[PDB]
């Protein structure tokens, strides 16, 4: 895709109404929300939706109840406003306490248990007691298991739609939710020669150690450029995460910009750079959209996503490396950490005209020059 296309709300048709999607956007041909839209009824007047990505599961719900709805995501917010759908940047654990009749919750099983757990907590104490709550998941991706503790968080539960492996099912709240579980965890790192201490909330990626990728795209350019070699230069990190890569680049003298699209990763970025004492900006953001059209950097770093075990670069993934390219000054300078076998030299030829392989074993780093 272009820019303009990767960046692009396409509003697409449904009975009475239109809903706007994007690539990078949760919640587009899932079938976890497409079977809570065939599933979710009206109960009571004010619902709350905890996952709703483009806004399709708990979308029957609209204009019948009041809805609100909490999305970590810039892109899925983009699109849930284009949407004319009310939506808050929040975390599912931001949720008032007893103040909703139903909530809607697509299990985040992507993002792990911890974020699970928090997410269920959170539809728990947002309901009054006798408030319902719609749960959707994917048996391959621990339907019962969830649905097992929100039975026991809540009190009856039954499946209400079954399609496959998938699953929608509906609870009633018949006894106290309990605390929210501690959510906040930190651990300490010594990279190139400097300790720093991470810190991050659940479902962020590479909880809990630094990424063995994302120091090998330090040490790569480290080497290449010099312990003195980012000073003073501005540096764009794009999809920044807790820190890994921004952290060391701003100890190192970077003026740095991370670009973020899950708030969690983007709260957790915030914490780690007051706890270690750095500066820099940790903006929440779908790839390059908070930044100005004119912004440019000496330096764009990135250990990009990838689907789990998948052969394919994803949209967001191909949309970094235009954006490097886009967005850095001539003579500026790229580095990407990737799995060995995705197939990025042919996008790096094509955005830069040539490429360089810094490292390659476990991770590839590869490297380009803004000509
Ligand atoms: C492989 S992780 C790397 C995190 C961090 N830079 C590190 O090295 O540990 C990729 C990051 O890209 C973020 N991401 C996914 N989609 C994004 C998007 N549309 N815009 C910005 N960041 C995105 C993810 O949430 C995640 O934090």
């Not at 139903?102 to 907590?121: E, H, I, K, N, W």
């Not at 968080?153 to 939710?177: H, M, Q, S, T």
């Not at 670009?259 to 004492?277: F, M, R, Y």
Request: charged letters at 25%; aromatic letters at 8%; one cysteine or more.
């Amino acid at each position: 895709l272009t820019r303009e296309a990767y960046h692009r709300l396409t509003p697409l048709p449904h009975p009475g109404g239109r809903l706007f999607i994007k690539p990078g956007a949760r919640g587009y041909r899932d079938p976890v929300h497409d079977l809570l839209q065939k599933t979710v009824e009206p109960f009571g007047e004010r619902a709350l939706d905890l996952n709703p990505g483009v806004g399709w599961g708990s979308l029957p719900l609209e204009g019948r109840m009041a809805v609100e709805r909490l999305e970590t995501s810039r892109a899925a917010f983009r699109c849930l406003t284009a949407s004319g759908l009310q939506a808050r940047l929040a975390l599912p654990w931001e949720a008032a306490a007893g103040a909703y009749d139903l909530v809607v919750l697509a299990l985040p099983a992507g993002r792990g248990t911890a974020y699970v757990q928090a997410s269920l907590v959170a539809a728990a104490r947002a309901l009054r007691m006798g408030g319902r709550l719609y749960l959707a998941g994917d048996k391959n991706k621990g339907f019962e298991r969830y649905f097992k503790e929100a039975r026991a968080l809540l009190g009856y539960g039954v499946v209400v739609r079954r399609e496959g492996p998938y699953r929608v099912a509906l609870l009633e709240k018949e006894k106290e939710a309990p605390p929210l579980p501690s959510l906040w965890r930190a651990f300490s790192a010594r990279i190139l020669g400097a300790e720093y201490t991470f810190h991050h909330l659940p479902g962020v990626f590479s909880a809990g150690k630094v990424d063995p990728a994302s120091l090998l795209l330090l040490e790569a350019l480290q080497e290449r450029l010099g312990p003195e070699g980012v000073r003073g230069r501005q540096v764009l990190d794009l999809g920044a995460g807790y820190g890994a890569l921004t952290l060391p680049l701003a100890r190192m003298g970077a003026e740095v910009v991370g670009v973020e699209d899950d708030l969690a990763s983007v709260l957790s970025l915030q914490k780690g750079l007051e706890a270690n004492a750095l500066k820099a900006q940790a903006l929440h953001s779908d790839v390059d959209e908070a930044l100005t059209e004119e912004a440019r950097f000496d330096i764009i770093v990135t250990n990009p996503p990838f689907h789990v075990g998948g052969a394919v670069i994803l949209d967001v993934a191909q949309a970094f490396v235009n954006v490097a390219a886009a967005r850095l000054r001539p003579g500026g300078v790229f580095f990407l950490v990737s799995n060995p076998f995705l197939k990025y030299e042919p996008l790096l030829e094509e955005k830069f005209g040539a490429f360089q392989t810094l490292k390659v074993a476990e991770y590839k780093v590869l490297f380009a020059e803004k000509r």
